[PDB]
Amino acid sequence: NQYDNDVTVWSPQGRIHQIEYAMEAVKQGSATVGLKSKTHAVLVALKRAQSELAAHQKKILHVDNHIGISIAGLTADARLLCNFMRQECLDSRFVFDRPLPVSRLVSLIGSKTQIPTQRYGRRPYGVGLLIAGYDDMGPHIFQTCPSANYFDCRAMSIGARSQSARTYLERHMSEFMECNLNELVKHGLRALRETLPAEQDLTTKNVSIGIVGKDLEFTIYDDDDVSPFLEGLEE
Amino acid sequence: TGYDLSASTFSPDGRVFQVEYAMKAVENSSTAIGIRCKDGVVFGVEKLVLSKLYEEGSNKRLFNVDRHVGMAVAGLLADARSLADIAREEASNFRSNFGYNIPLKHLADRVAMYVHAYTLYSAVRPFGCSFMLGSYSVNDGAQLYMIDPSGVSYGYWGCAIGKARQAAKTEIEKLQMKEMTCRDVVKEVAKIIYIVHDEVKDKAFELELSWVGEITNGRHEIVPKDVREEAEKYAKESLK
Amino acid sequence: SFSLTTFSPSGKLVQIEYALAAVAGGAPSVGIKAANGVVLATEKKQKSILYDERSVHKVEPITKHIGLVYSGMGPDYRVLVHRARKLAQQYYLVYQEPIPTAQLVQRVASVMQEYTQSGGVRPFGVSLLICGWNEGRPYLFQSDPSGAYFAWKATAMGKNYVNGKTFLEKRYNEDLELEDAIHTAILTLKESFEGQMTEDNIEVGICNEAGFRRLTPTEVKDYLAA
Amino acid sequence: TTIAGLVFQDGVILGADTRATNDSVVADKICEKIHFIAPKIYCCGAGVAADAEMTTRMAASNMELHALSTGRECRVATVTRMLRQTLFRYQGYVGASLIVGGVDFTGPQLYSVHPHGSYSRLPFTALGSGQDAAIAVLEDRFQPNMTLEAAQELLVEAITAGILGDLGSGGNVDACVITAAGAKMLRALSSPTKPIERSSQYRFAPGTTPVLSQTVVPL
Amino acid sequence: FDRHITIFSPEGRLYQVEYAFKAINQGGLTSVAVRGKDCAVIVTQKKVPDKLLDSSTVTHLFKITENIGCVMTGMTADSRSQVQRARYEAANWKYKYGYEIPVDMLCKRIADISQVYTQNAEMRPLGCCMILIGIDEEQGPQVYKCDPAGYYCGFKATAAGVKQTESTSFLEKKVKKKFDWTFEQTVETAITCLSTVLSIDFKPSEIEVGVVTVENPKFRILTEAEIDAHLVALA
Amino acid sequence: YDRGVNTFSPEGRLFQVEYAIEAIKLGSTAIGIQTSEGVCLAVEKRITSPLMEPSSIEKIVEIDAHIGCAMSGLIADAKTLIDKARVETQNHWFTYNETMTVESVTQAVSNLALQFGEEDADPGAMSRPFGVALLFGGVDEKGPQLFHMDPSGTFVQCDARAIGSASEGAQSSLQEVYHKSMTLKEAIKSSLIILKQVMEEKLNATNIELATVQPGQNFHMFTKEELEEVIKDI
Amino acid sequence: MSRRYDSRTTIFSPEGRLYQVEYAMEAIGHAGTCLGILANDGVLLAAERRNIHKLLDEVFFSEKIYKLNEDMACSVAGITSDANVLTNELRLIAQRYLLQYQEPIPCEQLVTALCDIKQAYTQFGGKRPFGVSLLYIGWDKHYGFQLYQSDPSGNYGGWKATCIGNNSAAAVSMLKQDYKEGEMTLKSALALAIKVLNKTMDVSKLSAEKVEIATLTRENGKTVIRVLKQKEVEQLIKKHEEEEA
Amino acid sequence: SYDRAITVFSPDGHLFQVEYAQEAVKKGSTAVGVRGKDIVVLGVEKKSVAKLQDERTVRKICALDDNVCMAFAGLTADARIVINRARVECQSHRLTVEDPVTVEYITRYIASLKQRYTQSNGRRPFGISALIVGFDFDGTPRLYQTDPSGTYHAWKANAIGRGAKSVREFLEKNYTDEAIETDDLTIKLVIKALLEVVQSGGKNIELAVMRRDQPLKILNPEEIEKYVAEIE
Numbered sequence A: 001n002q003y004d005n006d007v008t009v010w011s012p013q014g015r016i017h018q019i020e021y022a023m024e025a026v027k028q029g030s031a032t033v034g035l036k037s038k039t040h041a042v043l044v045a046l047k048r049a050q051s052e053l054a055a056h057q058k059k060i061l062h063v064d065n066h067i068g069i070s071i072a073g074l075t076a077d078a079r080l081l082c083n084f085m086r087q088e089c090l091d092s093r094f095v096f097d098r099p100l101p102v103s104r105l106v107s108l109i110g111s112k113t114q115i116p117t118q119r120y121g122r123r124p125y126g127v128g129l130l131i132a133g134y135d136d137m138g139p140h141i142f143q144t145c146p147s148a149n150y151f152d153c154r155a156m157s158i159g160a161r162s163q164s165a166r167t168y169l170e171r172h173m174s175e176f177m178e179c180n181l182n183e184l185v186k187h188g189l190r191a192l193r194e195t196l197p198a199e200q201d202l203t204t205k206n207v208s209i210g211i212v213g214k215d216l217e218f219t220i221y222d223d224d225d226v227s228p229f230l231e232g233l234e235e
Numbered sequence B: 001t002g003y004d005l006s007a008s009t010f011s012p013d014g015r016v017f018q019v020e021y022a023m024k025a026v027e028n029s030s031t032a033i034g035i036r037c038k039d040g041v042v043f044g045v046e047k048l049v050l051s052k053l054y055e056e057g058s059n060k061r062l063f064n065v066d067r068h069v070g071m072a073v074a075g076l077l078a079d080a081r082s083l084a085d086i087a088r089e090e091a092s093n094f095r096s097n098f099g100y101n102i103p104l105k106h107l108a109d110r111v112a113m114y115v116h117a118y119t120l121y122s123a124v125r126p127f128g129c130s131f132m133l134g135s136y137s138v139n140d141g142a143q144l145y146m147i148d149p150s151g152v153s154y155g156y157w158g159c160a161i162g163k164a165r166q167a168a169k170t171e172i173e174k175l176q177m178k179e180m181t182c183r184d185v186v187k188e189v190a191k192i193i194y195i196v197h198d199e200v201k202d203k204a205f206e207l208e209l210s211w212v213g214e215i216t217n218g219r220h221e222i223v224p225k226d227v228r229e230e231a232e233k234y235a236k237e238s239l240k
Numbered sequence C: 001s002f003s004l005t006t007f008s009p010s011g012k013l014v015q016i017e018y019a020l021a022a023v024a025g026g027a028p029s030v031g032i033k034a035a036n037g038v039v040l041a042t043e044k045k046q047k048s049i050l051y052d053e054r055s056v057h058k059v060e061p062i063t064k065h066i067g068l069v070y071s072g073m074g075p076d077y078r079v080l081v082h083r084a085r086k087l088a089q090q091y092y093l094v095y096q097e098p099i100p101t102a103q104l105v106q107r108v109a110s111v112m113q114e115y116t117q118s119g120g121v122r123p124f125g126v127s128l129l130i131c132g133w134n135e136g137r138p139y140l141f142q143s144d145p146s147g148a149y150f151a152w153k154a155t156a157m158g159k160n161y162v163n164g165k166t167f168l169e170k171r172y173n174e175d176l177e178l179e180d181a182i183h184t185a186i187l188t189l190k191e192s193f194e195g196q197m198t199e200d201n202i203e204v205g206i207c208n209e210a211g212f213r214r215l216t217p218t219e220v221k222d223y224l225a226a
Numbered sequence D: 001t002t003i004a005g006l007v008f009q010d011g012v013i014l015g016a017d018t019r020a021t022n023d024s025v026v027a028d029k030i031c032e033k034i035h036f037i038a039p040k041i042y043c044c045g046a047g048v049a050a051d052a053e054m055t056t057r058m059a060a061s062n063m064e065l066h067a068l069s070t071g072r073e074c075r076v077a078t079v080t081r082m083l084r085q086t087l088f089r090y091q092g093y094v095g096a097s098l099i100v101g102g103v104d105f106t107g108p109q110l111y112s113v114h115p116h117g118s119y120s121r122l123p124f125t126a127l128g129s130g131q132d133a134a135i136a137v138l139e140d141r142f143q144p145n146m147t148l149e150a151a152q153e154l155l156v157e158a159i160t161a162g163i164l165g166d167l168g169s170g171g172n173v174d175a176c177v178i179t180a181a182g183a184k185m186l187r188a189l190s191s192p193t194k195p196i197e198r199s200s201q202y203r204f205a206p207g208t209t210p211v212l213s214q215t216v217v218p219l
Numbered sequence E: 001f002d003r004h005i006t007i008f009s010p011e012g013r014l015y016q017v018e019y020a021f022k023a024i025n026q027g028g029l030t031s032v033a034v035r036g037k038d039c040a041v042i043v044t045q046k047k048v049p050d051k052l053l054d055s056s057t058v059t060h061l062f063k064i065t066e067n068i069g070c071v072m073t074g075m076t077a078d079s080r081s082q083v084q085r086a087r088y089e090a091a092n093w094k095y096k097y098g099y100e101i102p103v104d105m106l107c108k109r110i111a112d113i114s115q116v117y118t119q120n121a122e123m124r125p126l127g128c129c130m131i132l133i134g135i136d137e138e139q140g141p142q143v144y145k146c147d148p149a150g151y152y153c154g155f156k157a158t159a160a161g162v163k164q165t166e167s168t169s170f171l172e173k174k175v176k177k178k179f180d181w182t183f184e185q186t187v188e189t190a191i192t193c194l195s196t197v198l199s200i201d202f203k204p205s206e207i208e209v210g211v212v213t214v215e216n217p218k219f220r221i222l223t224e225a226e227i228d229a230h231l232v233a234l235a
Numbered sequence F: 001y002d003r004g005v006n007t008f009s010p011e012g013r014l015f016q017v018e019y020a021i022e023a024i025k026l027g028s029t030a031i032g033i034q035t036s037e038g039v040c041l042a043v044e045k046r047i048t049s050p051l052m053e054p055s056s057i058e059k060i061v062e063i064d065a066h067i068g069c070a071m072s073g074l075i076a077d078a079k080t081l082i083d084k085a086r087v088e089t090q091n092h093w094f095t096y097n098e099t100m101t102v103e104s105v106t107q108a109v110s111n112l113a114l115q116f117g118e119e120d121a122d123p124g125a126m127s128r129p130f131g132v133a134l135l136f137g138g139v140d141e142k143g144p145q146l147f148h149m150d151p152s153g154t155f156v157q158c159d160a161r162a163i164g165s166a167s168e169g170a171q172s173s174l175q176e177v178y179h180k181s182m183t184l185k186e187a188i189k190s191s192l193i194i195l196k197q198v199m200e201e202k203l204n205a206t207n208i209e210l211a212t213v214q215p216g217q218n219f220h221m222f223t224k225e226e227l228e229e230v231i232k233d234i
Numbered sequence G: 001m002s003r004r005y006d007s008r009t010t011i012f013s014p015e016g017r018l019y020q021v022e023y024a025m026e027a028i029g030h031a032g033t034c035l036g037i038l039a040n041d042g043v044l045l046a047a048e049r050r051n052i053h054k055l056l057d058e059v060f061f062s063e064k065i066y067k068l069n070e071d072m073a074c075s076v077a078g079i080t081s082d083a084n085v086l087t088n089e090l091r092l093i094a095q096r097y098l099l100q101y102q103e104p105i106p107c108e109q110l111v112t113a114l115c116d117i118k119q120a121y122t123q124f125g126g127k128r129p130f131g132v133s134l135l136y137i138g139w140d141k142h143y144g145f146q147l148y149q150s151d152p153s154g155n156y157g158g159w160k161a162t163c164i165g166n167n168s169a170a171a172v173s174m175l176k177q178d179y180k181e182g183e184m185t186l187k188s189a190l191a192l193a194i195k196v197l198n199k200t201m202d203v204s205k206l207s208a209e210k211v212e213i214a215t216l217t218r219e220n221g222k223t224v225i226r227v228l229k230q231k232e233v234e235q236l237i238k239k240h241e242e243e244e245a
Numbered sequence H: 001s002y003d004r005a006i007t008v009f010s011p012d013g014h015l016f017q018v019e020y021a022q023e024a025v026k027k028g029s030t031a032v033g034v035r036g037k038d039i040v041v042l043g044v045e046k047k048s049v050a051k052l053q054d055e056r057t058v059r060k061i062c063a064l065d066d067n068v069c070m071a072f073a074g075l076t077a078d079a080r081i082v083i084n085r086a087r088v089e090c091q092s093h094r095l096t097v098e099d100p101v102t103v104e105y106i107t108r109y110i111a112s113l114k115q116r117y118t119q120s121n122g123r124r125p126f127g128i129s130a131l132i133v134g135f136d137f138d139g140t141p142r143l144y145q146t147d148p149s150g151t152y153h154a155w156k157a158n159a160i161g162r163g164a165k166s167v168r169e170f171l172e173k174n175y176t177d178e179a180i181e182t183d184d185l186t187i188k189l190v191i192k193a194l195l196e197v198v199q200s201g202g203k204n205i206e207l208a209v210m211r212r213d214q215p216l217k218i219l220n221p222e223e224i225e226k227y228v229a230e231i232e
Helices: A017-026 A075-095 A102-117 A163-171 A181-193 A226-230 B017-026 B077-098 B104-120 B166-173 B182-196 B225-236 C014-023 C074-095 C101-114 C161-171 C178-192 C217-223 D049-070 D076-089 D131-141 D148-164 E015-022 E076-097 E103-119 E165-176 E183-198 E224-232 F015-022 F075-095 F102-110 F167-177 F184-198 F224-231 G019-029 G080-100 G107-123 G168-175 G186-200 G230-244 H016-026 H076-096 H103-119 H164-174 H183-194 H221-228
Strands: A032-036 A041-046 A060-064 A067-073 A127-135 A138-144 A150-153 A155-158 A207-212 A219-221 B032-036 B040-049 B062-066 B069-075 B129-135 B143-147 B153-155 B158-161 B204-213 C029-034 C037-043 C066-072 C126-134 C137-143 C149-151 C154-157 C202-208 C211-214 D002-007 D011-017 D020-022 D025-028 D041-047 D096-103 D108-113 D119-121 D124-128 D173-179 D183-190 E030-035 E039-045 E061-063 E069-074 E128-132 E144-146 E152-155 E157-161 E207-213 F030-035 F038-044 F134-140 F143-149 F155-157 F160-163 F208-213 G034-038 G043-048 G072-078 G132-140 G144-150 G156-158 G161-164 G211-219 G222-227 H031-035 H039-044 H061-063 H068-074 H128-135 H141-145 H157-160 H206-211 H217-219
Touching: A017 A067, A017 A127, A032 A067, A032 A127, A032 A138, A032 A163, A032 A181, A041 A067, A041 A127, A041 A138, A041 A181, A060 A075, A060 A127, A067 A075, A067 A207, A075 A102, A075 A127, A102 A127, A102 A138, A102 A150, A102 B077, A127 A155, A127 A207, A138 A155, A155 A163, A163 A181, A181 A207, A181 A226, A207 A226, B017 B069, B017 B129, B032 B069, B032 B129, B032 B143, B032 B182, B040 B069, B040 B129, B040 B182, B062 B077, B069 B077, B069 B158, B069 B204, B077 B104, B077 B129, B104 B129, B104 B143, B104 B153, B104 E076, B129 B158, B143 B158, B158 B166, B166 B182, B182 B204, B182 B225, B204 B225, C014 C066, C014 C126, C029 C066, C029 C126, C029 C137, C029 C161, C029 C178, C037 C066, C037 C126, C037 C137, C037 C178, C066 C074, C066 C202, C066 C211, C074 C101, C074 C126, C074 D049, C074 E103, C101 C126, C101 C137, C101 C149, C101 G080, C126 C154, C126 C202, C126 C211, C137 C154, C154 C161, C161 C178, C178 C202, C178 C217, C202 C217, D002 D041, D002 D096, D002 D108, D002 D131, D002 D148, D011 D041, D011 D096, D011 D108, D011 D148, D041 D049, D041 D076, D041 D124, D041 D173, D049 D076, D049 D096, D049 E103, D076 D096, D076 D108, D076 D119, D076 E076, D096 D124, D096 D173, D108 D124, D124 D131, D124 D148, D131 D148, D148 D173, D148 D183, E030 E069, E030 E165, E030 E183, E039 E069, E039 E183, E061 E207, E069 E076, E069 E207, E076 E103, E076 E128, E103 E128, E103 E144, E103 E152, E128 E157, E157 E165, E165 E183, E183 E207, E183 E224, E207 E224, F030 F134, F030 F143, F030 F167, F030 F184, F038 F134, F038 F143, F038 F184, F075 F102, F075 H103, F102 F134, F102 F143, F102 F155, F134 F160, F134 F208, F143 F160, F160 F167, F167 F184, F184 F208, F184 F224, F208 F224, G019 G072, G019 G132, G034 G072, G034 G132, G034 G144, G034 G186, G043 G072, G043 G132, G043 G144, G043 G186, G072 G080, G080 G107, G080 G132, G107 G132, G107 G144, G107 G156, G107 H076, G132 G161, G132 G211, G144 G161, G161 G168, G168 G186, G186 G211, G186 G230, G211 G230, H016 H068, H016 H128, H031 H068, H031 H128, H031 H141, H031 H183, H039 H068, H039 H128, H039 H141, H039 H183, H068 H076, H068 H157, H076 H103, H076 H128, H103 H128, H103 H141, H128 H157, H128 H206, H141 H157, H157 H164, H164 H183, H183 H206, H183 H221
Parallel strands: none
Antiparallel strands: A032 A041, A032 A155, A041 A207, A060 A067, A067 A127, A127 A138, A138 A150, A207 A219, B032 B040, B032 B158, B040 B204, B062 B069, B069 B129, B129 B143, B143 B153, C029 C037, C029 C154, C037 C202, C066 C126, C126 C137, C137 C149, C202 C211, D002 D011, D002 D124, D011 D173, D020 D025, D041 D096, D096 D108, D108 D119, D173 D183, E030 E039, E030 E157, E039 E207, E061 E069, E069 E128, E128 E144, E144 E152, F030 F038, F030 F160, F038 F208, F134 F143, F143 F155, G034 G043, G034 G161, G043 G211, G072 G132, G132 G144, G144 G156, G211 G222, H031 H039, H031 H157, H039 H206, H061 H068, H068 H128, H128 H141, H206 H217
């Protein structure tokens, strides 16, 4: 009623509806999925076009040589926060001269989203993030929330209809560790299929991926390299 | 009525309901307990498994504010990590000021003062998290303090935060915790964790334990997996 | 930061309207300017014997030759005390002379105006009655929270102030010595005050060629003998 | 500029001269120095004239409300902390040399404030250009808790030595007595210099001035 | 409107200031302090609801400085906040005016702090009232009390908390009959005042009593052994 | 009302951003076309009375020599952008000494779209979202390109795009007339066909403005002479 | 900062008017009667006194009449609170003129300078507008004797004769009848103002204490401003008494 | 300080603030101007009452420069701020450029102030709309009107105030290539445009004209009655 007008005012149950409305803003975006092995990490992003004549939007943003991220949420809220993520990673190589640990970057992402919450007049950032990266300890899959909560993950699927993918991620989780780069793409694209409708399924136009690895830096694939990846995969 | 809208506006009975509602949010958080003895202070936390899709070690509920100072928070995780770094800034600025580790009573005061500062202003919101602060030293000894959402600290021989608290506090009163040693106290901590959790609403969980005292040489340290499993087997003697 | 005082549909200020209604129900206070001195007799009532009369005094001097009494809120008055005294300070800083009563009341009444405009702040709840002595001519001024300051030979303020004004209208006239000014100020004070009258219940002070001074309870008891 | 003070058994007396000079010449022969702070607390300035003037003005103004806000007697040590914090705020930019003495609830007390802000408690001292002449006289003949008349004869001779022993010190001697019973001001208590007369007079007859233009405006 | 922020009511009152009064009784405690000839004694109830609660960390008797004692009746969060600022103001007195602040000038600056909260709608007033004691070298012992409104006055004895009129009513029995006030005989009235109204008969471990005397100007809290010596002898 | 410009919906979308796109339906119709021989832009002057001078109405502005622009929606917010849009384009040549890619032109302008807020801002902060939609055409090292932005700041490469009140039926009509290799002059013909259908008035030589950019010719606005030769090919 | 406590005084009415500005002129409408007359040989400004009590002092000068500078003067109708700041600001503005230009300020410049301040507060700042309307008199080197009128909205205009406060429309109606442009001098305008003051004032028994009259004229190259003494006003009462009956 | 957003969007995207600002423009007095060949003529009705108010302070016809003048209809208080700030910037332009100010260069600055102050934090939209008319290089006249929303446009003939649409109906129909051909036709057309809104008008109508490089000249009321004397 009167308690949804701002973030600061607590509900009689001790909840903030504006944070809830920010967490429901992320679920209105595109559905992306990602996973990691004991060696590599693959981020499968679903691209959607505004119209039939319009080209597909870019859901993948390059951050660091070993780091990549997929955005789901308000587009511009991701952009301003992407300028914050890239600045902190550039500051890491500007100061420490090393790739910023992916766990340290996400902790800075939450601190940026904790600032608007406790203050009146500030809106929280309504974009969610699925970020991946490789370091001395191996690849890592991290997820963030507009509530500022962030978790460490083996594999996750965000967006609409993500449970059909997450259920797939639960059954094959045993295989995700020992598969190699070519199989991670096969499991990643087949995991994307469950978030997709029953009509439009898989085309190299609206489907793009990215891969980071042991000695392999993060690389974005679009069409030419994705076409043989889709070949040889049943649905 | 409009009286509970802002924390700066008092109720007709002379109370602030905004601070009260922040306390009700703490009651939904998972249960965390701690006990101090002559040997040190023992920590424990119930970490609920939300899904099997989460990596081991995720959502760590054992917070380390300072080398000799451990912390366990039950409440909003967003305000938890906020105050976590802020409490570390106060301990770091203390060392940058007085050149040693801040005592637990002095640290609990400065942190609680900054919690109460947001209850006065209507342009901000009070913290929705409550936490306990343990410490150990050779001059002071084992000490345990808990800070509520209203920013008031109380000394405790033991405390419980989260959903189930009064039930766990009475179980601690039934036996003397002072003469015990942290090896025997963690046996009771794991025993209480199994009593608090049953299968009704929640599904699965994991035991997160921490020690400070003579065993850890006065430094905040997590319990290893080897001792944790052995400490569970001592509780499995009776629960099972 | 938005102004809490706005114009009513009738043009009056709503906030200052309750400020004047607040000082109308304060502690009864009267004053008289007669001959070479001005008499200030106020009401300090204590609810119990435990109260120490020497700790808190309602009649306070602004400076040697100037003094002030009040009817209204306690807290808002002490804020007026500090700022008016600091204004007399900053006066003596620049001009290095005792401050005239006309200039003292003018710039202090301007402070009352500032909170009828600046936002997030309420107007003062105190109506000040100023006494001063300059160049051999006594001064009796009256200021209210509205910021408009007037001048009076004799007046009344506080609970039942209309009666005190009408009583001095009938009884008081010119050619009254300072001794008669005290005894007239007591008679008009007997009307507004109810109950037994002692030296602790009333706080009296005067201002003359020797400056503003507060009366001790010993000499007040001498005037309680009629 | 010779200013000095002495604490005796029953009180304290602050001496000063009447003469002020600007760098080539005497500005005023009768110019007063000792200022007013509290009825029982008095001070006197030195060094820069306007800086010592304005500083005592802010001191007397701050101490005035402290007497009005407390309603009690003023502490002499309170005056000194006000003076040096102003000197500290400007980092010694103010060249005011101030001596503060008086009688409080504790008793007669004399302090000293250097333009750099350093404060020292002491029974007797002197400040200004002629300070070394008065300090030497007060150092030799001082005795603990002297009689009021004995302290009056000594300090007047101390200022007299500070005058005769300084080029910037002259005129009459203004001594101010402060006792537990009350304070009393003595203006031009000592006048060591008799020759106040002159050997001739100058008068002009009307019409000896070459006036060119003349006009009258009535009022 | 007048009941949300602090502004003049239709009768010229302030309801936010009145609710600050009603916030005092919400503490659930009662304190009393009596001004004696050579002494000043504060008696308050020490509440330890939990067995695990450390008694040494729960104290209602506060020390502003050596010769000044303190006790707080009201919201605990506001109480400890004002005392910290009271120690900031008390030290500012000595750093400025040079000597230990008197109890009258200390209650004045603390009252001026509550005046700023009242006139300004930005900051809310504190729901705690402070009772200060001490001994001035001129007028002797000084016992004062400051409400959240900013009003303070010299009290021969003070009363606060749940019991107010009934606590004062017993204090009227002693002052009207003009009883001799000494160290023990003020402790005789203080314990009897709180015991008869609450129908308890406090034990030495249930209360804490601060004392200051002419011979001992340093404020000190009585030990349970001494309180027991002042209990049985007073029984 | 009872909310800030930063207040989220129960669905999680800003009200101020939603109403910004809804305000473009009140603007002027402009249809851009991307072809292999260049980028074509066309817009109607929308003259409601003979007393007005058509020279004062410029709905097609030139960002750079090879880079054009189109205009719709709110007029007040667009003029503000243009000075910045021109300035950042020259700041590019002032820094890197090269022509800014039209994708970077859309990138620098899209940054200032979202920046709007209330607290924790400067005096140069803007209160309300942009009510303007823009079309950036041009030719660069990659050839002719035509881009579009909305109040939310999203820029997307488009083969053909229409803006304004008639963009609902014009965008659907662009898919019909655009096939494979269709040239600039053929796109100009199809541009006047769709534009004449969507306007309520009659198509005239001085009623609409037509400007095209080519790989071998700088962005050029067709004068009244050439406009009469273009309309007579219908 | 709570947006419920903001009335947003910058809101336009559906007719395009400002509420706080219209409520300001209504408060001025209750102020006492104040008028002025521009005449050939001088300017005349007279006003009544609404506060009447036997214990009043009034040891000062006039009530609603102030002196802006050597060559100018003003009257006051409105809230006496906002009048004190405006009187201070007008004097500050007229003096800041003396800084740069070092000449007596033209009567047109001082008016538009304060009005720019009045409209700035109604434009932004959130502070309430001013509730005082002011009349201005004086002499300048260019236009000579001048009489102006100001409104709290910041609007102003030149006037040969006008009236503000109570009974304003009644005095204006009489100015449209008796006042002779370019004919009646300062002497004839003095008898005319007293006639208008007595007829428009329903309160009987007009006394030298109940009314106030001030004159400003230039004589021998010097601006002469003065306020008629109560005996001098009583002499004018004896003159008008015979005229009246 | 006072910082908040004043002008905010509605469900339809329209701005209630700006719309109410334009309503105050409609209630202003009627002012008109017309571009001639080498000349431009501005005029406004005046509502003076009983020979009381002075005619020196009423003038709504203001000059931004020797070659640029203007007239306004709206709140007379907001116009004095815009006219002053426009003249400060117009001459600051002549500081930056030795050449004079083109009418289009001052119009873009003026309307820009109505853009900023409308959307600025805590500020207020202007309730005025003015005709900025002047002569560009070579002597080509230009006529521009601003908008409280901040938009501006070019006009051969334009009018503002009450009945502004009615005056444009006269202008729209009677303005042809025959119109404003010579000086006698330009003067009559501007007067005949005001003859419809005449209500107890007489001398009260005020007119001004500027010719090539000559400064703005005000046509005295006696010649007004002589030009109104010929209606046939």
